[PDB]
Design a protein around this ligand. Structure first.
Ligand code: OLC
Ligand code: OLC
Ligand code: OLC
Ligand code: RET
Ligand code: RET
Lengths: 310, 278
């Protein structure tokens, strides 16, 4: 329920990039390039997996900068503003993940890397996307910062659960998953309470589209805990798990933009509903000013119009 | 006379693009050599990953045009995104098949690299359609379009046949195809020009500004392929480098069109509710 202006979405956007331009430098300071080259060789397709995701996110932002300029309203404008920066961070993250010497941690389950840059992306992105849901539905400013902060610590636990021994990993990882359902349960009830046809303040998106948001987010964010579960269990390869993470990272953020584009293209029907009513009352005003009986000015006035409808 | 389309006509034109490609996919699985394809994806490990990534990029790019079709401003700006909804879908199933199927290919005489006929069979189905599609954004002669459409169809074929020829003739058949490429592009730049006139007889379904963008998007995005194969056959870049460029250039040329229809449809609604405020 922030109801922020375009200059606020710029101020939050420059904060995300400077709080990122600090994160990358932090992860470049602790770099061990001998092992980064060793990991980017033992797992060959990684530099291609992440480099392909960065290019895919480059066009993802271009689709938002078009939706931002050509936005139908100033309400839907500031919504594509947050997605413009959230998807831009996804591109500079995977660009650096695929070309830079970054900091990662050995995990206890299988000895795999923990990219931390991608975790540092989600802790910058995922809280913002829940604040984004706090505007498409206009929930309470507290009920949003609840799940917003609960989802930030959520990602942190699953990151700092890979280092832990067997049992404290299971218990910290299971603690993050329980918090996940909390975020997805409050959201489904956050949009569901905004979809009611009797709801002030009327949401900046149509009522039906909110169901698409609480559907797309639920069944796209669920992939990440499902991959970290299987891969730690040892039931899928590391790269096969990384490939899913890169595509799920794409479908989750891009899925919102295509819904924003869908909404901006749907107000055209709303325009064509207003055009109908205007031309209906316009023909109504003429009937309220004419007299329709035997007033012979062409034929009888009534049959002239009746022949027109015939 | 001129060049027009209709919704049900692009629907049957759409399903013709897929059945002439389904036939193509069968022929290339039929003549394929799986023992030789395994060697390709072995030496070039990133090939299978590139195509599968390109396919994912095109899967979403198709669905964006479906939203432009159901929520189109005009009956003509519908049958324009309709062509792209089939063009961009072929790219999704072409790259999904290139990354997951045993396909037929050829060894080029220049450097022994593979020549992906499935991709060549994609452009032969795409490029002549986008030029029929360019005959609807500008409404050129059905003869002026049939020329470039059949000249671009043989253009991609000549560049494919050039790989199998010896030294001397491959030079001239390749150069003979690039000479026709400029013939296609020169006719396009002047094809939008006739419609870009503020006093044109059949008003084009696009504004004058959006038409100059198209003749710039199609010039600067299509010129990459004749530069990739050039710098790859000469040996100035690795094969996988030219494939990654071909995997990105193939996305820009077709999503560049998809984002023009979005911005024009969006520019139309914002202009229309303004004309309602007044
Ligand atoms: C253990 C993983 C370590 C990774 C290594 C890099 C860490 C840097 C990442 C984030 C910095 C914190 C800045 C963002 C903090 C967001 C907290 C939050 O939830 O804010 C929501 C907001 O209240 C909605 O209105
Ligand atoms: C009716 C438009 C159909 C366009 C193609 C869709 C099917 C593409 C499949 C194979 C193309 C093989 C090469 C075909 C060469 C183009 C044929 C042509 O000249 O069409 C011009 C049309 O008359 C201008 O209105
Ligand atoms: C000026 C154009 C006026 C309007 C006409 C529109 C049509 C343009 C179409 C093709 C032009 C040539 C395509 C680009 C070919 C460049 C090849 C080249 O210059 O090669 C340099 C060399 O490869 C370095 O490494
Ligand atoms: C754009 C990136 C997004 C939306 C990432 C979302 C991640 C989640 C919704 C959940 C992640 C995890 C858990 C629920 C538990 C284990 C740790 C994670 C990060 C895999
Ligand atoms: C969607 C796919 C498109 C737009 C493909 C376009 C291909 C070209 C514009 C050109 C291709 C070639 C040449 C000009 C010369 C050598 C042969 C080709 C196919 C590389």
């Amino acid at each position: 329920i922030a109801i922020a202006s375009t200059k606020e979405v710029q101020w939050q956007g420059i904060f995300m990039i400077i709080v990122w331009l600090c994160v990358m430098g932090s992860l470049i300071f602790f770099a061990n390039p001998e092992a980064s080259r060793r990991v980017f060789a033992k797992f060959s397709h990684l530099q291609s997996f992440y480099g392909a995701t960065s290019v895919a996110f480059a066009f993802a932002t271009g689709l938002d900068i078009l939706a931002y300029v050509n936005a139908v309203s100033d309400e839907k404008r500031v919504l594509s503003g947050i997605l413009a920066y959230v998807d831009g961070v996804a591109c500079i993250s995977y660009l650096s993940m695929a070309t830079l010497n970054l900091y990662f941690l050995v995990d206890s389950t299988q000895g795999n890397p923990v990219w931390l840059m991608r975790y540092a992306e989600w802790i910058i992105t995922c809280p913002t996307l829940l604040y984004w849901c706090g505007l498409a539905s206009r929930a309470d400013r507290s009920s949003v910062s609840d799940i917003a902060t609960a989802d930030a610590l959520l990602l942190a636990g699953g990151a700092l659960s890979s280092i832990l021994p067997s049992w404290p990993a299971f218990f910290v990882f299971a603690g993050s998953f329980a918090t996940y359902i909390y975020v997805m349960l409050h959201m489904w009830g956050m949009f569901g309470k905004a979809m009611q046809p009797d709801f002030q303040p009327p949401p900046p998106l149509p009522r039906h589209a909110l169901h698409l948001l609480r559907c797309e987010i639920v069944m796209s964010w669920s992939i990440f805990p499902l991959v970290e579960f299987l891969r730690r269990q040892g039931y899928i390869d590391f790269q096969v798990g990384e490939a899913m993470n890169c595509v799920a990272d794409y479908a989750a953020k891009v899925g919102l933009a295509m819904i924003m584009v869908n909404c901006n293209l749907e107000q055209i029907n709303a325009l064509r509903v207003q055009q109908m009513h205007s031309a209906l009352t316009g023909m109504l005003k003429v009937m309220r000013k004419t007299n329709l009986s035997s007033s012979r000015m062409a034929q009888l006035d009534g049959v002239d119009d009746d022949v027109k409808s015939w």
